[PDB]
């Protein structure tokens, strides 16, 4: 059959893999998105709505939505839950004070029936901080090992150096662009 | 460690100049030139030469001299192997290492040397990782680059580098799933004037050309493991399992690869395949003499001997030499007094031999001995060591690759006294 458009797209990478990025205030989500799209650090003010940029990597056209973490908009994430494939969840490497709220909201988001089919990737941003938690202790506080029937993984990362951002994209590429 | 590398031909010209730490004056190569001059042959160059303010460690291989420079204390084995490895990699990327091969591809070889050695320290040494950091100079790749602006330099660190098996790139696929193994054996031997066995041994090595896809776990085992001793093992093998199970379970990397090497214990007599009848006359101050050599198979295990060549370095007394070969080719260079006979193949119906008269120097006394006899030979489909494989299992993949093995015995340092 005349499917040459799809073959032409696959000659360069048609994978889209829509991703919704959610998290708490000052976690660094927005900086992560904009450094992935551009590379540098950009002066930014608190985001109160949502942003969007399209990034291409390993022939995959990842699209990440940056919905804000402010409580004034927090329940609004429900409207973006449909039709997503990836869920980025940034955790501040030294937010021991608001870590429990982060885990509660993360579990709530995992409780959405629409998000049941997604893959969860936890970015432990702010890795540079000295008093930053390691990956193991962050996982221990989050209980991501207690999860079941959910493909998951965690990855330490430092945005100001971009440490591991490509690596998180690689992990998603392996799982989001899985066998099917 | 290593400051810079000079690539110098046997001519005495300096072709490829490199530097890693500081600009080393080219005058330092004058000491190498003088040391080469004092010696009696290019082959006689020392590997460690001392200069007032530098040390030179040299390799000789393939008519090219590789002299490096060192200013601190470094273990000689380290430098000598790094240089032999740059030579090996040159062979891998260009068939061989020649001044033509270098000068024709200056940019790629300079990029390669830059990638491999960093501030005199090892950075990239494994073959497969180097294959992906910089691509081989394939002509189709070159025209593709010219067409699309594509580059010979990669932009992503290959995943194998950060993998628990740094010796092979991950995610390699081939439609033609297959793998070849090569067990090559060399017969080191010294044979006296009486034809007795002076000292002989078998040097055996396993080569493996692997074209498997995915992440296979190949297993190599042998019918007669007890014949294997002092066995070598590449990092790719799991030494613990070999010590326990006596099994070669491993993950081979891509491309050409030398798997393991071994020797045969002196407990079992080495089966010498070829014997020789030999006779040369040297009358004192005579202008002429006679030469008689007859090559014979002693223990061929019922297999043909082929690819036979006999080289003799005649003494200074010899001027010319009048012989007729029973087969092959007779060649004699009077300048170097080198007697080379291409023997080729041995037919049981008639044993090849070489005989005739030698045109000596009149007034020159007879040499105190006859120069020894070196002979090359190859046997196909026969391993004199009697080593045999047991099985070749695979785990981790689902395909069934083409599986095969060879057993080729090539003559080792086989020299016959006379």
């Amino acid at each position: 059959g005349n499917i040459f458009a799809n073959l032409f797209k696959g000659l360069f990478g048609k994978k889209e893999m829509r991703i919704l990025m959610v998290g708490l205030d000052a976690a660094g989500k927005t900086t992560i998105l904009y450094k992935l799209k551009l590379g540098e650090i950009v002066t930014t003010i608190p985001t109160i709505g949502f942003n969007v940029e399209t990034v291409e990597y390993k022939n995959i056209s990842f699209t990440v939505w940056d919905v804000g973490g402010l409580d004034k908009i927090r329940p609004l994430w429900r409207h973006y839950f449909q039709n997503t494939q990836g869920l980025i969840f940034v955790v501040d490497s030294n937010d021991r004070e608001r870590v429990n709220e982060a885990r509660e909201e993360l579990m709530r988001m995992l409780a959405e029936d629409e998000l049941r089919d997604a893959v969860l990737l936890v970015f432990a941003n702010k890795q540079d901080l000295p008093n930053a938690m390691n990956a193991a202790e962050i996982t221990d506080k989050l209980g991501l090992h207690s999860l079941r029937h959910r493909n998951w993984y965690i990855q330490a990362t430092c945005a100001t150096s971009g440490d591991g951002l490509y690596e998180g994209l690689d992990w998603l590429s392996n799982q989001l662009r899985n066998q099917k | 460690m290593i400051h810079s590398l000079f690539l110098i031909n046997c001519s005495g010209d300096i072709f490829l100049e490199k530097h890693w730490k500081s600009v080393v004056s080219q005058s330092v190569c004058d000491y190498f030139f003088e040391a080469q001059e004092k010696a009696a042959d290019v082959e006689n160059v020392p590997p460690v030469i001392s200069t007032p303010h530098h040390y030179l460690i040299s390799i000789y291989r393939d008519k090219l001299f590789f002299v490096s420079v060192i200013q601190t204390e470094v273990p000689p084995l380290f430098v000598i192997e790094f240089l032999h490895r740059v030579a090996d990699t040159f062979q891998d990327y260009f068939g061989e290492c020649s001044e033509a091969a270098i000068k024709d591809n200056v940019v790629i070889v300079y990029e390669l040397l830059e990638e491999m050695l960093d501030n005199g320290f090892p950075l990239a040494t494994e073959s497969n990782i180097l294959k992906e950091l910089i691509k081989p100079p394939t002509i189709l790749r070159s025209v593709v680059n010219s067409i699309t602006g594509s580059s010979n330099v990669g932009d992503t660190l290959p995943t194998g580098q950060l993998s628990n098996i740094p010796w092979r790139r991950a995610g390699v696929k081939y439609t033609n799933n297959e793998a070849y193994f090569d067990v090559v054996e060399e017969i080191d031997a010294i044979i006296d004037k009486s034809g007795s066995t002076v000292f002989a041994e078998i040097q055996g090595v396993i080569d493996a050309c692997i074209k498997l896809s995915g992440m296979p776990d190949l297993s190599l085992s042998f019918m007669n493991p007890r014949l294997l001793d002092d066995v070598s093992f590449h990092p790719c093998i799991r030494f613990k399992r070999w010590e326990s199970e006596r099994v070669l379970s491993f993950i081979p990397p891509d491309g050409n690869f030398r798997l393991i090497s071994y020797r045969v214990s002196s407990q079992n007599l080495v089966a010498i395949p070829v014997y020789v009848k030999h006779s040369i006359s040297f009358k004192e101050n005579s202008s002429c003499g006679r030469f008689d050599i007859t090559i014979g198979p002693k223990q061929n295990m019922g297999k043909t001997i082929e690819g036979i060549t006999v080289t003799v370095h005649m003494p200074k007394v010899v001027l010319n030499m009048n012989l007729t070969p029973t087969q092959g080719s007779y060649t004699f260079d009077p300048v170097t007094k080198v007697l080379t006979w291409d023997v080729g193949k041995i037919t049981p119906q008639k044993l090849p031999s070489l005989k005739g008269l030698v045109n000596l120097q009149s007034g020159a006394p007879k040499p105190e001995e006859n120069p020894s006899l070196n002979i090359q030979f190859k046997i196909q489909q026969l391993a004199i060591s009697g080593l045999k494989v047991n099985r070749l299992d695979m785990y981790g993949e689902k395909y069934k690759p083409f599986k095969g093995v060879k057993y080729v015995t090539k003559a080792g340092k086989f020299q016959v006294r006379t």
């Binding site: 450094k35 992935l36 330490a156 100001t160 971009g162 440490d163 | 580059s151 010979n152 330099v153 660190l157």
Partner: protein, 150 residues
């Protein structure tokens, strides 16, 4: 050496093989044209922050390699920043950069000893050898440091 100013202008080109070649040229001739060689250091600074860690490793190699005595402080900062890059390949290149700095500036020995002491605790298999190489190169007599890591 007469062509240094013409080459140095391209030190920020986006064409990668051109990058590698200009890196070669700067490494070759930096020690003669001190003032001219200063120009590439900002491009190196920016490259040190790239999300691609391999580019970071290349930038670290070149930034260490430049033997212009003025750039001592920025190089010192560069090794300290690379010290915990959380990218192990960058870590190995950092160990080599430590040896480079000690070769260039003897007076930083105490700081280099501190950063190397930081490095030895690494569990990564592909950094330990280079770190040990750095130890031998800079402070052979610090038998005290390795005691815990034996």
């Amino acid at each position: 050496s007469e062509l240094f100013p013409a080459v140095v202008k391209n030190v920020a080109s986006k064409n990668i093989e051109i990058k590698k070649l200009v890196y070669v040229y700067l490494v070759r001739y930096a020690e003669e044209q001190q003032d001219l060689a200063l120009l590439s250091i900002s491009t190196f600074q920016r490259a040190l922050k790239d999300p691609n860690q391999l580019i970071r490793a290349s930038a670290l190699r070149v930034l260490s390699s430049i033997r212009v005595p003025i750039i001592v402080p920025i190089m010192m900062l560069a090794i300290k920043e690379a010290s915990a890059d959380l990218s192990p390949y960058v870590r190995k290149n950092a160990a080599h950069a430590i040896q480079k700095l000690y070769s260039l500036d003897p007076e930083q020995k105490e700081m280099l000893i501190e950063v190397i002491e930081k490095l030895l605790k690494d569990k990564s298999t592909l950094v330990a050898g280079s770190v040990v190489m750095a130890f031998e190169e800079v402070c052979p007599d610090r038998i005290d440091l390795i005691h815990k890591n034996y």
